[PDB]
Amino acid sequence: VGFGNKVSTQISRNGDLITDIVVEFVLTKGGNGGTTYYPAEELLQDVELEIGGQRIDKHYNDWFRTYDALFRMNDDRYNYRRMTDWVNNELVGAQKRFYVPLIFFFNQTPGLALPLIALQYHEVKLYFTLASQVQGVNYNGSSAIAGAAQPTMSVWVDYIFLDTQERTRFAQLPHEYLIEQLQFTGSETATPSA
Amino acid sequence: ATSPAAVLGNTETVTANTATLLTALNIYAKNYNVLRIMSGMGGLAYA
Amino acid sequence: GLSQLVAYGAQDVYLTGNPQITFFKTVYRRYTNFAIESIQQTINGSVGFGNKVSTQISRNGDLITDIVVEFVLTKGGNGGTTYYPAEELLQDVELEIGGQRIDKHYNDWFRTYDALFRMNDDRYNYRRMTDWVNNELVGAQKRFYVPLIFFFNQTPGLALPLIALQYHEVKLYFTLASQVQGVNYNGSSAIAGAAQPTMSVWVDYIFLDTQERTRFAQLPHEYLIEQLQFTGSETATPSATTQASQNIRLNFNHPTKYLAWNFNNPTNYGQYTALANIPGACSGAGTAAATVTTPDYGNTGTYNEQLAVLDSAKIQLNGQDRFATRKGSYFNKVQPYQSIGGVTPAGVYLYSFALKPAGRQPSGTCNFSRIDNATLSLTYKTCSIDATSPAAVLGNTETVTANTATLLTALNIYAKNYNVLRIMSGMGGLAYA
Amino acid sequence: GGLSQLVAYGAQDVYLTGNPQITFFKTVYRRYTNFAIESIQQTINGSVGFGNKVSTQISRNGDLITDIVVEFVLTKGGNGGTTYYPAEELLQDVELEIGGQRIDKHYNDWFRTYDALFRMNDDRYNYRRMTDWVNNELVGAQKRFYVPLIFFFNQTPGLALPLIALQYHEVKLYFTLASQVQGVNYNGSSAIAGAAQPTMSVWVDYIFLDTQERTRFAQLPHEYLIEQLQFTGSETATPSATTQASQNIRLNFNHPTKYLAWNFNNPTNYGQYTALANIPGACSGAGTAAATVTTPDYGNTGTYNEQLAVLDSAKIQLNGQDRFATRKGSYFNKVQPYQSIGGVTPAGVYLYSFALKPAGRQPSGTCNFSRIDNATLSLTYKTCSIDATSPAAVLGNTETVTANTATLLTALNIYAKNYNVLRIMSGMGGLAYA
Amino acid sequence: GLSQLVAYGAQDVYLTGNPQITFFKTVYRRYTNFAIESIQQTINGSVGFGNKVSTQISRNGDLITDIVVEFVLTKGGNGGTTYYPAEELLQDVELEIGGQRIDKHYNDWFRTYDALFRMNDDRYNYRRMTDWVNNELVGAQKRFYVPLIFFFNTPGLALPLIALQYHEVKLYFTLASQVQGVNYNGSSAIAGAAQPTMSVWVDYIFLDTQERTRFAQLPHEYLIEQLQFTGSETATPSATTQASQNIRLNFNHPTKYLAWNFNNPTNYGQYTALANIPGACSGAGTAAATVTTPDYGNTGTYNEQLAVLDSAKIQLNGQDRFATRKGSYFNKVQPYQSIGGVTPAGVYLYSFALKPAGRQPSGTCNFSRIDNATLSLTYKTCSIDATSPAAVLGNTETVTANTATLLTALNIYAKNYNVLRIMSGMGGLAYA
Amino acid sequence: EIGGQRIDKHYNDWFRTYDALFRMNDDRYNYRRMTDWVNNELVGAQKR
Amino acid sequence: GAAQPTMSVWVDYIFLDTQERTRFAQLPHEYLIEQLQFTGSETATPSATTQASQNIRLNFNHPTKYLAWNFNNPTNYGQYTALANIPGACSGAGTAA
Amino acid sequence: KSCSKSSANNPFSNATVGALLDNEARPPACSYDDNDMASTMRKNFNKGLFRNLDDVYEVENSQRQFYTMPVTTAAPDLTAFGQFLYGSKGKTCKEDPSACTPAFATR
Amino acid sequence: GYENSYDANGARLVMDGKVVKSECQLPSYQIRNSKHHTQLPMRSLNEPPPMVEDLVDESLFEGLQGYPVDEKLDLLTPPGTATPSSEWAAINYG
């Protein structure tokens, strides 16, 4: 784990189903208040969801920003910002643990919890890319910040433990889940002028 | 862009000279697919 | 013999479930009787710089393979002022059968092809037949031989059965370049008094004995052949201040063996890299007289990666990454290591969809006819290095190149693919349009 | 014309073209299964840096795996001429393990020995381009290097490891990084202040099969005839200016061996298989007043000048019996590879094949050392009487002598390339017997 | 790679439908249970310059392949004064079975063969085994290895000594009376030069019981190659004209190819004119340059300007077998097409075979059915002053150096097939 | 191309030859109006 | 300074009713259609002193409705005739230029 | 022999958790070649999957990501793997004096 | 809940926005009575044979891809005789 590095994790079969996934990051401010913008979100450059070797989905830091811009709101949005940025005028050197929730379909509703118990021979993996630079943390515009700390990371998965009747049905029955995917491409803007 | 009189006023069809730095475009599409699980294995119904 | 084998260390071996033969039990195969003759074609149209000429291949033999175009060029300047001028001269060749275009090669393709697939002494000899490689001087005259590289010009296995094409003629349409460096032009300047080229087209025709002539003349034939797809485009010219990027829709079809591409300076044939004041990297490089606006033409090609512009690239097919993004150096050095076994010059890139892209036998393909939206995504290096200062070039980092690298404004993307050439009752053409 | 040749037909032609079996002008290609190849980055555990040991488990993305390429990013700790295949030097060793069983193990020196013997022409140059700096790069320069692995499944798709068939077994690659790399973080014995630690990444090329073949791989038992590398490190009988030192080395080797290979070296300088001398390229500053024969021209460490090689002659003896007549070191250095490989082997590197074509994959005769109670390599060294600082002595001398600096070649690395059998059943892999 | 697998269409059926092979799973066809041993042969006759020696190949193994002749030579001068001296030393080798001559190689043939068929590192390594390539100095001693190039010397072929119980197989080797840079320097002898040491090595194959028995008892017909050779006078090139010549070729048998060169008998391997351009003569490029003596270590060159063939055609039974082509066609294109290596100036090849570098026949011209085979040559005009680099390098296609008239010897080779019949312990060639 | 098969192909010269033989009168003129400039247009003029 | 073309391809589509649509989907069809066959040949160029002649193999197949041909100057599109100094027959025809 | 039958609830007979309360000591799935369970495996594979009639080769529905693991029983069956790697050629040179041949042991 | 449709094998097909009710709506129904040439799914039977390799033939040929001429060489449709209805590839979804 470090800036610009690619790391990964496999979700163990600790429970029967999985929903929410939150990635923790610990960063220290490389400058004063006003120098960062959702730095933990920026840091999570991307995340790829793969089941059995097949890409199911993939999110990007910019997507998280776009998603938020459109779909979060009010105090959901503010609380979200509180988990990814410094919003109480913290100063240089301040240390903070950020919580960056994932928004894959199963990370939003129990209704789509992945049936890990029914995926006995398929691994479910999350591939993470950490940004090479995070504004106000290890870089200021194009300039690197001397002495900036490398991130500490942890991936938390919230598991559902089912009782016998429900667990058995998941274990024995075939399943079908209506799921979401994000498609994304970058393009050059036909830049306008004066 | 350095002059509020020009920035906070002016017209609907004109933006900042600094808007030309917005050279990247990101287009996203969120869609519905089907995740199928059978015999301990899974994947998407539509590739 | 057992006592001997034990004495020399038992050399007993592993056998499989397939029929086995001992190592030294061999046999030669009996093959159809044939002969090969080199025959001169008549070329119509005026031969000269910038002119278009053509020829119909005479039905002298039964099958055709190798085709060699001879050119006679003279030196308009001294040694070091030319770069594969015979290859540069032959701007392109169209291959047409029965009026259908089967394929087409370009001087740049010949250069890219060479850069990726020829090698060692083979490559040197190729250079010997296309350039002035013995320090020849101004006024020197030489006969160059430019082999064509159409599918039937690479293997006898795809010899075109003229005998089975009684109604369809095969023609070659050749475009000669308006200018050739070190022959009739020096950079942008014309060379007064430069000689016009002499051209001759030779076709090596196979004469078959009776049983095969009969079989070819009457039986339907289906050939698996190669075609070159090509899309020229503007390079998202690298910036001297940042990293340019580009997404190029690939207008390709068919079961593609590989993609190949390069960035170049359209002014200077074969220039796929930036200019610099380091030996060989520019005209006069390494000394006081060096200029980084003009190449050392005789040393136009180079393996010096610092002068290349591709930082990284990926191919996206129908919206999904085909492979993880890799550095330009992957496509320049590793891909050809893995799949060809030669050494590719800086500025030239390869990505194979095949195990053996250099062979005749298909070995994995990417059928772009089933890819509604294929794109090549390119990331460029930052052109911030002062090319006139070797320290700036040679002591620098990975993602940064020469300021002169912004001169590589043209991009050529190629794709080699399979198609099927069907021949019946004297006529033929391609199965897939 | 060509017709005048076809008519020239007689009895001698029947042997070549009568009752013909094949032709050369309408090829037949074989239909083959569908597949795709994808380059996928692996996650590598443990810090990467000089002297670190890291490892990776190959993700089950595809069905079969072949090529593995280790990427490194190194910086120059000095100017051009100070490094020699530094990416190779850095990757000190690589272990291949399946299910916890060690299958094979390569060493930085092996990669160098292998290259010296088996790669060639432009392949060798391209190979150098991916592991060294070859365009006169200067101090501070940064470059990405690619070190391909050469394990049996990294050579041909025919031996792709059927990862899909290993349900209970993981395949892991363990990489040991050298504590020091010449011209990157050290210059001879001295450390280079400010040198960067290497960046590292491991890529695996995964074969994606169609459904029919994928299913068959998952359910069928699998067998492959594969390669392994054996290695024994030992000391060279001290070469000496006053005599011809000799040595008898018992080789603790087993299994059907395609070939033995070896080199002598100065362990101080990676890739130094010959003595140093004051002739161009043979030492640091060679050819001039500033030349020293204690340090190599690192960028030109290797040479074809056999005078500087230590070995005079050698043979392999099995259970007391000569395996072949004693031959000169130049026989192992030049003829063996002429015949068996076709490339050009540098001085100080030797090959002895038991196979008709050791450079192939196909068995073509092997020495099964599991049947030789005492396999011994017998070596006789050249007298180290040449004054390495004097070209007249270096270049005008006899067959039986070498440089006084050849006494520095105290390390001996003997390798053996053999076959073994790889078997897969019920989700488990590992080695087998036949 | 899943995104490529889904891209499957009608065009792919021809490649992968009803698949016949798989690239991901291989099996081997051939097995051995065989061993290889290197054994020294006894040389009869005295070894020395100008001497003829011979050896009988011992029946130690069952089959034989490579044969390497080891020679110890010393330098009679400094680096650059020799040119493939171990190749020059072995003037020729005859192969004889049962007393019948099977074949014969010549030092010049080894040079021509190499020029056409060896390549890249293989070629360099060959040079390393026959010459001094690291600027060795006078007095240096070196053990050279000259592999032979007979029909049985690819790993898939071998000569069945075991099947020849009543016939001996012998090699007769002629050592040159003079070797450049070893015992002679141009025409001068080198006082104190050492006589060579020679050793002949044969690599033997030890077969298992079944394979051995079959070779020992069964009749065989081995398709073998032979070298035909005719030396002749070259129509001497001249400053005044384009010399021309018609050489009658007394060749026979299915021939894979014809090859030839023009040379100066004085200097081994000199196939080109000398000139005052770097490498083209002793001291070339400077004041001390002499265009009467080669830079021996750089005798060979790729600069066709110093070659003498303007054009050529081969006539068979009075017919032109191909259109007349320039010397550069034979020098560069022919080997491009047929071999894939790079041929030095002054050496020419014309193939009748698709791939003459293999063993498997791939088209031959049967000269046993040709009554009139003639090589028709046109030479370049020798008007270029060899001592003036501008003249040498800035000239035209039809001309060469005034010093090109020194290449008065013409060597024409033909490589063909024959059949070596072996049975009941005896054997020989079906055709002669 | 239909299903990958070449069904047919027209050439610029064919369009010219076809027109020369089969179009006529104001069909031909109106055609010319759609492929050329027939109202004495000058350099820089642009048309669909 | 010449501009590159802007291009677009327009297709006129026919929308069928339920009944016709059904027939198209269920019935097999065949259409008697036209195809163009075409090859280029060199002209046996005539000259000042002669009437050249030429036999051109007509490498055609299928029931042919008609043949059509022209002679032309490859340099100038649509030029099927000789140039002359008569009005319209050459650049500047009829005048000094 | 006792070839298992891919059912509607376990279309590939992969035995993930599918052995609970029904054949805990499950026999192997099927060889996929002998006893053609491939057609019924694909027939079990759909059970309400809607193809678009454009994917004529049956590959857009991610069928490559569905297969049968090499172990479909409750055990890894180490005895078959062990008998596959070793155990063959019974009665060695050390025990009974008729199987030795003047060379050493097998390798 | 389409319990009455065209089951392909285990899947219900969709061609023009609606689920395929019966076999009469599929295109294969127009050529269901002709013995087709190839059936588009192309299920391989029993694994494909391996790639036999040797060091004798490849070394003796020195490349040259010697192709055998005594194969079957499955012909095409002669231009004169139309295209037999058999040449239409059956896309038997079920």
mmCIF file of N, CA and C in Angstrom, chain D residues 95-118:
data_model
loop_
_atom_site.group_PDB
_atom_site.id
_atom_site.type_symbol
_atom_site.label_atom_id
_atom_site.label_comp_id
_atom_site.label_asym_id
_atom_site.label_seq_id
_atom_site.Cartn_x
_atom_site.Cartn_y
_atom_site.Cartn_z
ATOM 1 N N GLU D 95 11.808 -18.556 -7.399
ATOM 2 C CA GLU D 95 11.377 -19.931 -7.149
ATOM 3 C C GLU D 95 9.977 -20.145 -7.642
ATOM 4 N N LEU D 96 9.775 -21.276 -8.287
ATOM 5 C CA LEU D 96 8.472 -21.672 -8.781
ATOM 6 C C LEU D 96 7.909 -22.750 -7.899
ATOM 7 N N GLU D 97 6.781 -22.473 -7.236
ATOM 8 C CA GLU D 97 6.183 -23.475 -6.307
ATOM 9 C C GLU D 97 4.707 -23.736 -6.636
ATOM 10 N N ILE D 98 4.312 -25.015 -6.679
ATOM 11 C CA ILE D 98 2.919 -25.406 -6.920
ATOM 12 C C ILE D 98 2.406 -26.263 -5.782
ATOM 13 N N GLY D 99 1.415 -25.770 -5.054
ATOM 14 C CA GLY D 99 0.861 -26.552 -3.955
ATOM 15 C C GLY D 99 1.804 -26.643 -2.769
ATOM 16 N N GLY D 100 2.816 -25.799 -2.756
ATOM 17 C CA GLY D 100 3.843 -25.831 -1.737
ATOM 18 C C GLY D 100 5.060 -26.649 -2.186
ATOM 19 N N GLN D 101 4.957 -27.372 -3.307
ATOM 20 C CA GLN D 101 6.095 -28.143 -3.777
ATOM 21 C C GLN D 101 6.986 -27.261 -4.626
ATOM 22 N N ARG D 102 8.290 -27.285 -4.397
ATOM 23 C CA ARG D 102 9.111 -26.484 -5.286
ATOM 24 C C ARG D 102 9.231 -27.250 -6.585
ATOM 25 N N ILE D 103 8.981 -26.572 -7.685
ATOM 26 C CA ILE D 103 9.063 -27.157 -9.008
ATOM 27 C C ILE D 103 10.404 -26.799 -9.595
ATOM 28 N N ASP D 104 10.768 -25.529 -9.478
ATOM 29 C CA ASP D 104 12.038 -25.087 -10.032
ATOM 30 C C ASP D 104 12.605 -23.865 -9.301
ATOM 31 N N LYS D 105 13.813 -23.458 -9.691
ATOM 32 C CA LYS D 105 14.488 -22.277 -9.145
ATOM 33 C C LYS D 105 15.582 -21.741 -10.052
ATOM 34 N N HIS D 106 15.498 -20.458 -10.375
ATOM 35 C CA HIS D 106 16.477 -19.803 -11.238
ATOM 36 C C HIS D 106 17.255 -18.791 -10.435
ATOM 37 N N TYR D 107 18.450 -18.467 -10.895
ATOM 38 C CA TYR D 107 19.331 -17.521 -10.217
ATOM 39 C C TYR D 107 19.743 -16.410 -11.164
ATOM 40 N N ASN D 108 20.062 -15.219 -10.658
ATOM 41 C CA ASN D 108 20.519 -14.139 -11.540
ATOM 42 C C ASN D 108 21.638 -14.581 -12.457
ATOM 43 N N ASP D 109 22.558 -15.362 -11.917
ATOM 44 C CA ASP D 109 23.653 -15.888 -12.696
ATOM 45 C C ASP D 109 23.134 -16.851 -13.749
ATOM 46 N N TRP D 110 22.091 -17.623 -13.432
ATOM 47 C CA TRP D 110 21.545 -18.531 -14.425
ATOM 48 C C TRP D 110 20.980 -17.747 -15.552
ATOM 49 N N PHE D 111 20.240 -16.699 -15.244
ATOM 50 C CA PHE D 111 19.657 -15.938 -16.321
ATOM 51 C C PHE D 111 20.775 -15.476 -17.246
ATOM 52 N N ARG D 112 21.894 -15.030 -16.659
ATOM 53 C CA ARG D 112 23.078 -14.570 -17.439
ATOM 54 C C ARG D 112 23.693 -15.727 -18.245
ATOM 55 N N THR D 113 23.831 -16.910 -17.633
ATOM 56 C CA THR D 113 24.415 -18.091 -18.283
ATOM 57 C C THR D 113 23.528 -18.562 -19.416
ATOM 58 N N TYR D 114 22.235 -18.622 -19.153
ATOM 59 C CA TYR D 114 21.255 -19.020 -20.121
ATOM 60 C C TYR D 114 21.350 -18.112 -21.301
ATOM 61 N N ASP D 115 21.335 -16.808 -21.061
ATOM 62 C CA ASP D 115 21.398 -15.860 -22.148
ATOM 63 C C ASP D 115 22.657 -16.055 -22.965
ATOM 64 N N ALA D 116 23.795 -16.199 -22.274
ATOM 65 C CA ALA D 116 25.104 -16.363 -22.887
ATOM 66 C C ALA D 116 25.123 -17.547 -23.842
ATOM 67 N N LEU D 117 24.424 -18.609 -23.484
ATOM 68 C CA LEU D 117 24.367 -19.783 -24.322
ATOM 69 C C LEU D 117 23.228 -19.848 -25.332
ATOM 70 N N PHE D 118 22.006 -19.524 -24.917
ATOM 71 C CA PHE D 118 20.828 -19.778 -25.737
ATOM 72 C C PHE D 118 20.169 -18.635 -26.490
#
